[PDB]
From a paper:
The camelid single domain antibody, referred to VHH or Nanobody, is considered a versatile tool for various biotechnological and clinical applications because of its favorable biophysical properties. VHHs have typically similar structural characteristics to those of human VH domains, consisting of four framework regions (FR1/2/3/4) surrounding three complementarity determining regions (CDR1/2/3). In this study, we investigated the impact of CDR‐Grafting using a humanized VHH of therapeutic interest on the affinity for the antigen, its thermal stability, and its structures.
We selected a humanized VHH, Vobarilizumab, as a model VHH containing a humanized VHH framework. On the other hand, only Tyr42 among these three positions (42, 50, and 52) was involved in contacts with the CDR3 in the crystal structures of 7D12‐Vob and Vobarilizumab, and with lower values (BSA values were 22.9 Å2 and 9.6 Å2, respectively). In wild‐type 7D12 the identity of the residue at position 106 is Ala, whereas in Vobarilizumab it is Phe, a residue with a bulky and hydrophobic sidechain. The results showed a dramatic decrease in the melting temperature (T m) of 7D12‐Vob (52.2°C) compared with both, wild‐type 7D12 (63.6°C) and Vobarilizumab (70.9°C).
Residue numbers in the entry: 1 to 121
Write the structure that this text describes.
């Protein structure tokens, strides 16, 4: 089993910046996916940004050009750099990892607990 610990959330002014981190511990084998999700009232849960093993990244239309996903492969840590934050970015942000021990297994998804980011004055 794998545990994900998130940090870096809180209250920021519109136009502001925040960096989230997501550190993995436990029995980490092959990481297939590292991704950020967010939940807000009336918006369900949305994939914000992801990195697939290979380096191929993806972003929600709403955050393209403002958010950057990165990872420290050596430390199994996932980052989200947020710039030019807008009130509509207010949400609980989650990280998820998919891990596998071989191509013959279906993989397992592990979740961070979530961290609130509030963009208001």
């Amino acid at each position: 089993e794998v545990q994900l610990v998130e940090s870096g959330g809180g209250l920021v002014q519109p136009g502001g910046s925040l960096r989230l981190s997501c550190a993995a511990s436990g029995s980490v084998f092959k990481i297939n996916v590292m991704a950020w999700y967010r939940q807000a009232p009336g918006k369900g849960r949305e994939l914000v940004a992801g990195i697939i093993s290979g380096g191929s990244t993806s972003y929600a239309d709403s955050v393209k050009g403002r958010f950057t996903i990165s990872r420290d492969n050596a430390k199994n840590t996932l980052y989200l750099q947020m710039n030019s934050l807008r009130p509509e970015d207010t949400a609980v942000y989650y990280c998820a990892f998919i891990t596998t021990e071989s191509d013959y297994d279906l993989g397992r998804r592990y979740w961070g607990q979530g961290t609130l980011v509030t963009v208001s004055s």
